Amino acid sequence: MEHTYQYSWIIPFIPLPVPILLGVGLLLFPTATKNLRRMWTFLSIFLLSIVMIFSIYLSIQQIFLSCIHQNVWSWTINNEFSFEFGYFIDPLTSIMSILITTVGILVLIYSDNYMSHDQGYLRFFAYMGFFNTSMLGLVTSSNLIQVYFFWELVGMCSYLLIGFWFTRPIAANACQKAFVTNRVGDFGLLLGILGLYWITGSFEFQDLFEIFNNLILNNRVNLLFLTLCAFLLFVGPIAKSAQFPLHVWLPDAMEGPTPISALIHAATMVAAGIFLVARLLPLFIVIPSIMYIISLIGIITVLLGATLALAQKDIKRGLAYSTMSQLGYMMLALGMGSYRSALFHLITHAYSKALLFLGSGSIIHSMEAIVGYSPDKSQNMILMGGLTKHVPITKTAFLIGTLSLCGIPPLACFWSKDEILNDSLLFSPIFAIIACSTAGLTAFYMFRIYLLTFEGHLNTYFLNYSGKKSGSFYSLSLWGKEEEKKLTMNNTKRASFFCNKTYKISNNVRNQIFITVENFGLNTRTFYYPHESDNTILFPMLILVLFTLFIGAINQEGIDFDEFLRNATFSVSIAFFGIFIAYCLYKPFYSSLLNLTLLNSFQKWNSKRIHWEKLINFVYNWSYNRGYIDSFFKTSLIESIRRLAKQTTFFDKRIIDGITNGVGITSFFVGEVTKYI
Amino acid sequence: LLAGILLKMGAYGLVRINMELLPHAHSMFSPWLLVVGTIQIIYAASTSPGQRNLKKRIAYSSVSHMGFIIIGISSITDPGLNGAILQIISHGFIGAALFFLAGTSYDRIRLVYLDEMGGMAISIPKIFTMFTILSMASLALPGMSGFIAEFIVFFGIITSQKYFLISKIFIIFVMAIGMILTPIYLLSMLRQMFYGYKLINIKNFSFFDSGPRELFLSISILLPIIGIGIYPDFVLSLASDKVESILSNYFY
Amino acid sequence: AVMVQQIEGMRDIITEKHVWHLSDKAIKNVYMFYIMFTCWGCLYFGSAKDPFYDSEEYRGDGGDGTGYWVYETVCISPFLILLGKKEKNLEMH
Amino acid sequence: PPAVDFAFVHSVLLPDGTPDVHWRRANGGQKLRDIMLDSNIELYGPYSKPLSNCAGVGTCATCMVEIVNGKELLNPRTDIEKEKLKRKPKNWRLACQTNVGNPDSTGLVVIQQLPEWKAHEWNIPKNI
């Protein structure tokens, strides 16, 4: 305590110098620093390991000693600013610091091989290290000034990571939409911290906590100003944690890397909003209506995040909407006032879905050998099919992750969601059974994802489907030296060479002579099956498996750090109901464990597809059109600004530049007239 | 220099002549100049996506950032006027570097508008990374001087003795829409002239990148922006005494 | 520098408050060295092999260093081919 | 009765090296997607999983079928076949956006199901 918090200012700045050296290396001497290709990787990993060990040491001192350190320095001293940039060590700082550092180290170990076949390598690790710098500075922040500072820097790093692969234009639309949405949240954080400075005059996390115990009891401040100030202060976490108004940036983040899917969300950056709301809960329990607003936004986005992940063709977008629905669970917990269970659910999701993203990217890099390089091919969860037979450790890691979200008590994570629903049902009956219903839906789509990825035949090398596969397996025909010397140019064999005559019909033969000329055999015959990725992909997945097994059982440390059977079996029953409904739909007949009489009766009861033909249509159109909110925002929010921009440059160039140009036009005209008069 | 220093005189004169020579009529019309600056930021930030031209977007971007100077001058406060001086120096660097890089981008690519001139960032990555970082400096995005400039302008609004809450809420709201509109045109410029891929541009052109001279220009403007964006007393400390001497005439 | 803060809500706070400022002279010093760096960089990087503004891509076509050399080029070289076409017709092509 | 003569040539070959034609029967025209669902022929391929289709509305290009000699009794494209599939060999239509017409109909349209994942080109006769 005596000498370890005075050097707590380094944990933002320790990742920083390798993006500083890359930002002056790639920008000045690109052959030199790209010749030092893998060394900056290990240097970023080592500096983040230093920050990991120091954050673990601060966490050990937080669980031993109950104290908070606020090691503030001075930044500007001219007038009423007197600004500080200090570092606020609460238990939330320890949770967020280990949550950044462990996930960042594992994503960097992953990204050594994810980017190992990328021409863009070092600028990705510059963005990674500068993002880790910015987010660790965000969580070690003693005032809203520095929260605002590193908040916008995190938004910039999100822009850079999503538009990392800058040559593809869908990532360009993605990163523009992402940074603009983060700036719509930044907007609210601005006029929210300025509203708090007008209500308090604080600009510090220290004095807000001892002013908001009696600020609402005053007559000068308005309750309306406090609730609109707190709502605008919540607009920021809406944009970071991808809540219902500002959610349209999250599923477009897929076009960048898969490590940024593991780090922009299921990690640090969507935990920025959770960190902010949980840090400001001593001034969110005081303002009465904002708690209901946070509960309302969470309970609106949990039905949106659930129904979106039901019918995604993309693996990464589906896990993104799963991340958004779990972030809605976190905001629903933050709307409970639950100071403890919200952060614990944050920890277990941020170690669970990070593992799920690394498993998804291992699936993707295994599929790259099959389909070549394409996100509509190598990220399409439909034609993944089954990979249990091929990549087993990826299967085990992805399965432990999806059971960590499905809520399995012994060997996965369930106690978090148990505390969520336990704190939910004694609060308001409207919010509770729909939360359990979304939990059942969450188990449903996560098991749907697991079955479409790992369980069944491959859907791409399947001999019913691929014609090049049937041409490649059968190097010789079924007769050997008969029926052909091989036959190419197989003609229009409608009659099947049976000399079949025709009754009264429209036509049998015509002037149409079209031969189905098929492709050949014995050429690129191999079609190498998706083998396992190297050690740098499995090793973060093994460590995150050890996390999600270790955190999933956490006389407890629930109070010193910061209906028992019926509710638990109800949550497990509705989750296993989602398991069962996904299992009977996607798990094929040759590998399912169910009795074939019941399995036959599933299609026998439902062979009509008329009362299913509207339900599947509505759910798929919802998940495909993004609840039509993407189309409405691209119709009347950004194209409305485009029409406003064209109208405003019309008013500029035509009828205020028109007046100024018309002064000279009139002087020319009166000069030409009075010359000739 | 037309945008770096020639644009900021006058705004200098609004501090020099129109603020210490004529205090009471400046107190009369700064209610109107505040509203005109708030309309200025939104108006010029919305005329910028309407510009197909590259360099005109940066021109109206300069008109947009002058609104913070007009507001900080009209904010009858030390944080207002001091953020105005900071925005003078900050956007001197910002406009100078952006118009420099736009001139060099026109010299390389030879394409003026933005319906053409698609993905060029693989062709000129040094110009792309400097133009990207200086766009971030234009975004009032931190580690850069425009951030702390506009935030001290906001702080001068919110700590005003001239204005009441009815005005201040509207002023903060309209100004804070401007830092949403500014990413729209800046990142539209970035995704037009740099992001993307044109199939015809593979090896036959093979454009020359930023040379070391132009790269020193961009880095040497970038370094004081960063040095002020992380330690803003490189501007406020050389003028806060004089701004106290100015506002001594206004607060009595 | 040690202040123990008593807030009833969460916990006690051990704020440090190292108020500091770069010395008045040191701001002049960092200005002095940055003007030195500007001087050095202007001289040295003006004395550099400037790879774009030397070649036949820029100096060859037009390349006076303005922003209109493209436009006067594509506005005068068609007049050059019209002049050459008239001088071609002057000898009956 | 008016019986349209679909052929429904499958995408993959037989291992002998000849295509396998199935010659489905169903009456008239309501939707080609409903005909291929009802008469048990393989439309979607890998998209035949339950939530792997838009259940007939056209918002996904998952029911695509190459149709040859299919200019006789077919509806035109509803600006969804023109938009979902764009850069195609122009003989490819969505079964949930095409229709072979009216119930009083005879014809010999032959449809290659799954134009994705095939190896034969059909050597189409050049029109006009």
Ligand code: FES
């Ligand atoms: S089923 Fe969606 S395309 Fe026909």
